[PDB]
Amino acid sequence: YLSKYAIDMTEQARQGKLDPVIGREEEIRSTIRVLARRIKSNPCLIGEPGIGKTAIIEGVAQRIIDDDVPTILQGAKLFSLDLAALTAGAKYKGDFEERFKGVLKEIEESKTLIVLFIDEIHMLMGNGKDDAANILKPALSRGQLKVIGATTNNEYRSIVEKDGAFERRFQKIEVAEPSVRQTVAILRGLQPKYEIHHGVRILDSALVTAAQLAKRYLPYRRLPDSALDLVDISCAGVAVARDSKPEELDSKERQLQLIQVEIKALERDEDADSTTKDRLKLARQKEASLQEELEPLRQRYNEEKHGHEELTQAKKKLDELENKALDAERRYDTATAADLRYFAIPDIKKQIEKLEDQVAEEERRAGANSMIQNVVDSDTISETAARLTGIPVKKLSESENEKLIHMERDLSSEVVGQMDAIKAVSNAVRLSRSGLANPRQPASFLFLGLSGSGKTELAKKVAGFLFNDEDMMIRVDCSELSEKYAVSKLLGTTAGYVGYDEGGFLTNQLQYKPYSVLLFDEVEKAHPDVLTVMLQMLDDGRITSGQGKTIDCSNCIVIMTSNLGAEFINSQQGSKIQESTKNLVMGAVRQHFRPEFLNRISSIVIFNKLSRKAIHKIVDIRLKEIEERFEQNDKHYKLNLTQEAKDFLAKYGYSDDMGARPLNRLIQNEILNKLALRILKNEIKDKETVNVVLEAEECLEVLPN
Amino acid sequence: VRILDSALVTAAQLAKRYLPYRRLPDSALDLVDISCAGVAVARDSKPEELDSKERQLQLIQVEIKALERDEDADSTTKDRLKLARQKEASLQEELEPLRQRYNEEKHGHEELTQAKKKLDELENKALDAERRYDTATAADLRYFAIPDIKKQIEKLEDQVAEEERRAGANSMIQNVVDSDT
Numbered sequence A: 001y002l003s004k005y006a007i008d009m010t011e012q013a014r015q016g017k018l019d020p021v022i023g024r025e026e027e028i029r030s031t032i033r034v035l036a037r038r039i040k041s042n043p044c045l046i047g048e049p050g051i052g053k054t055a056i057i058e059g060v061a062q063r064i065i066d067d068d069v070p071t072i073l074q075g076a077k078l079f080s081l082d083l084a085a086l087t088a089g090a091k092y093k094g095d096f097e098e099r100f101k102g103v104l105k106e107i108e109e110s111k112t113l114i115v116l117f118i119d120e121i122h123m124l125m126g127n128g129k130d131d132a133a134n135i136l137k138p139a140l141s142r143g144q145l146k147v148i149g150a151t152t153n154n155e156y157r158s159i160v161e162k163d164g165a166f167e168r169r170f171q172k173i174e175v176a177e178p179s180v181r182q183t184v185a186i187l188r189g190l191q192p193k194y195e196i197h198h199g200v201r202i203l204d205s206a207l208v209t210a211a212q213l214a215k216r217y218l219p220y221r222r223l224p225d226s227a228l229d230l231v232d233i234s235c236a237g238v239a240v241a242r243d244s245k246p247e248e249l250d251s252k253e254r255q256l257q258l259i260q261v262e263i264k265a266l267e268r269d270e271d272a273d274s275t276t277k278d279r280l281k282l283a284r285q286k287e288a289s290l291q292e293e294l295e296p297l298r299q300r301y302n303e304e305k306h307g308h309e310e311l312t313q314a315k316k317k318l319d320e321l322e323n324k325a326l327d328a329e330r331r332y333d334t335a336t337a338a339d340l341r342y343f344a345i346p347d348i349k350k351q352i353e354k355l356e357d358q359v360a361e362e363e364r365r366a367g368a369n370s371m372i373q374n375v376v377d378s379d380t381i382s383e384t385a386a387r388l389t390g391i392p393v394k395k396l397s398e399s400e401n402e403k404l405i406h407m408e409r410d411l412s413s414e415v416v417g418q419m420d421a422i423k424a425v426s427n428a429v430r431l432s433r434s435g436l437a438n439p440r441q442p443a444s445f446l447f448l449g450l451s452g453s454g455k456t457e458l459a460k461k462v463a464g465f466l467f468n469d470e471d472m473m474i475r476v477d478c479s480e481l482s483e484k485y486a487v488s489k490l491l492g493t494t495a496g497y498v499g500y501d502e503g504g505f506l507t508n509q510l511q512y513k514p515y516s517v518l519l520f521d522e523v524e525k526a527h528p529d530v531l532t533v534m535l536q537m538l539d540d541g542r543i544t545s546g547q548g549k550t551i552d553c554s555n556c557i558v559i560m561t562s563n564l565g566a567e568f569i570n571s572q573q574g575s576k577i578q579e580s581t582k583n584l585v586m587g588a589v590r591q592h593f594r595p596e597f598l599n600r601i602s603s604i605v606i607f608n609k610l611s612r613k614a615i616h617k618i619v620d621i622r623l624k625e626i627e628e629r630f631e632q633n634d635k636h637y638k639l640n641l642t643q644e645a646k647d648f649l650a651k652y653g654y655s656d657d658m659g660a661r662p663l664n665r666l667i668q669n670e671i672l673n674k675l676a677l678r679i680l681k682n683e684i685k686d687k688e689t690v691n692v693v694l695e696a697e698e699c700l701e702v703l704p705n
Numbered sequence B: 001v002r003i004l005d006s007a008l009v010t011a012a013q014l015a016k017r018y019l020p021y022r023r024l025p026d027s028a029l030d031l032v033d034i035s036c037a038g039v040a041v042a043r044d045s046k047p048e049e050l051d052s053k054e055r056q057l058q059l060i061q062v063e064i065k066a067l068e069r070d071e072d073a074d075s076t077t078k079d080r081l082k083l084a085r086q087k088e089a090s091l092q093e094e095l096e097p098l099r100q101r102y103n104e105e106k107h108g109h110e111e112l113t114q115a116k117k118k119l120d121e122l123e124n125k126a127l128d129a130e131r132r133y134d135t136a137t138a139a140d141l142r143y144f145a146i147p148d149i150k151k152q153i154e155k156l157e158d159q160v161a162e163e164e165r166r167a168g169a170n171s172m173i174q175n176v177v178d179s180d181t
């Protein structure tokens, strides 16, 4: 009774009822190719989920369906296999065997050409193996019973290593996440299914932005479904608003009720017969306007909706007319194709065109309909992504280039001085951007200078700037990168030893944050063995863990920080780094890192000493930022440090060893302490006044309370 | 898929040369099996050349029929389907010979397939007979049985025929080319 679980996908394809397959034509051919092999003919689709593996299998079916497959496979019937067949359909330890043997018998003995498939090949075997199909199939594997499997490459590798024997039967086919442009084409191919499902028009630019967004917004989900997820969700958003619309409709009915109350109050009161408030007639104009407007808002919006419903159904009609016309062509019924395919042409073109004309236009805009009822690229999808990811405007405004154009400017606002560091970074970043750099390796930098210099701050600010999120940064505790390196580190414990869920700190965090910066805290303290590990992974971003699991990085900016040249910067020969001083640094770097390492760094950057000139600005800046990030609209500060607190901060706070590190702490301590005190006075309600009253910091600033 | 002999020569060379860890007796076959499949796929609808032209034919056939029955089917806008039909037919006239050459040769190919298998079966059984000194059984499997299969093979190979350009003068090679494919 395999027929109770197995799904004859070939038949479903004969009936359509499947999404079209876009962009995998070669994978399909490859699959077919493998199936066509006389010996090695059991392919697997190996790679990530959400990228059309099913579609490929179905694509094969579709070619079988349309006689676009060599005879050997042309007559084949493709069946989805499932856990349910052996588990749900068994519920006893050995009934898994019986259910599978059922399949093997029924299939081996009938209909000549049958292909089975498992979209979860790892599922077979399972933990403990238990001959969960996995041996029985080899037992009869010479007896045709062609089958295609599939899994995440990382697991595939593990499966090969775990089982071995199926390797002699199965042909992995590498599949991969499609490009953005391919994705858009896919989205376009699937667009009508959403159009129809939701009854929402989709802008072509919207599809484009969905893909663009998936690449920075849903960075760990696979692009094609992810973009589709954005589409589906976005469409749902629109549809929900569309079929409800209470914000305008209910608010305005409530506004009518309120103006009616005002009018009656004005009509019968002491001032009703006076000059005072003789503007009552205008309230009546509002009431009358609403009395006439409100039902038309409900009806007009529904008229817009109806235009979109009819439009949707016209588009649906086309999909259906073609699904049947094309099936007629498939079945060689050229008479129906001549009639039906034909009718579809002016039917849908004239119907849809005029239904689009119902949406119409106004003198000031295309689309007279005010409820939009479509997916608007950024207004809908990017907005949706923002609803899924945060910081709407900066995310909405992303354009690559505007950031790159003003990047150093903006960064110099965040980071004071060391503009050359900023420019250096910006430049390398610009090369990473626009694809000028070789894509195998992201820009990467070695930040040299003292604690409190901003090396890390900047790197975070850059992440801030580039990803609109400073906390994208992944930190690496380099001094802990000992000769024992593996377990809590990117490599992770080698598979086969206890730990599979390894290196989450870096492998997974990076998986979740590809669009980030990886930063090495005092990289010179890393053990040399580890340095070679990161080196191979420094460039050649295609990182693979000790579990054999590929991480795959490219984009991630990599920044190393170092105090190695601290002695040279400690010369304090002005702020700006001087000749010789910098060379001593280079020397030390060359001693510590093999040039091979260094050669992979896009740039080695030496930060200047911030000195007093920078902190004159930094303390002002940080103080303001502290307020701004600290609170929103219940605390409103003057933050006027006056020259005296600025000087105190510079004099006692700023350190030539610890840089701004103590400035931050100091500012926070003293301001927060004064703030808390006056808050406790509770004679304190809103706005602000600040001031200064005259060992280290004996003045203690002292603001009014 | 018939394959030019030099292919095999090159396959083994290529396998050793480029399929690092795979062993020759099997990896060479992997190139064969894969490339055979390559061709088997490439040929799609019977031999190569034909497939592509059939795809043109079918796209044309549909266009013509859609054009045939339309609001403006009688306008030269759509009536151009008659010229499209000349193309459909012209393709059909090339496609048929490609199909027929492939198919009749295929038939011969299958007859060769079976004949050779049958030849081996007769000899296997005849050997069983001779090792037992059973000349009667060996004779039953050698007199007529064997002359029949051998002559079928010779006739079939001649009908298939071969050219310097290809191991199959008609179409069942799908133009597979040693090193190129």
Ligand SMILES: Nc1ncnc2c1ncn2[C@@H]1O[C@H](COP(=O)(O)OP(=O)(O)O)[C@@H](O)[C@H]1O
Pocket (backbone or CB within 6 Å): A019, A020, A021, A022, A023, A024, A048, A049, A050, A051, A052, A053, A054, A055, A119, A186, A224, A225, A228
């Ligand atoms: N071009 C495409 N055509 C149809 N589906 C696609 C395409 N590209 C990606 N997909 C998606 O891949 C999914 C099915 O394949 P896949 O995700 O790899 O299988 P699985 O369901 O195991 O994840 C579908 O949800 C489908 O939307």
Ligand SMILES: Nc1ncnc2c1ncn2[C@@H]1O[C@H](COP(=O)(O)OP(=O)(O)O)[C@@H](O)[C@H]1O
Pocket (backbone or CB within 6 Å): A414, A415, A416, A417, A450, A451, A452, A453, A454, A455, A456, A457, A458, A561, A610, A618, A621, A622, A659, A660, A661, A662, A664
């Ligand atoms: N605007 C700024 N310009 C330069 N440095 C800054 C600025 N603001 C803060 N910093 C300091 O840089 C430090 C973080 O970077 P870094 O000096 O490398 O720190 P750490 O040595 O702890 O890793 C913080 O202590 C921070 O106060």
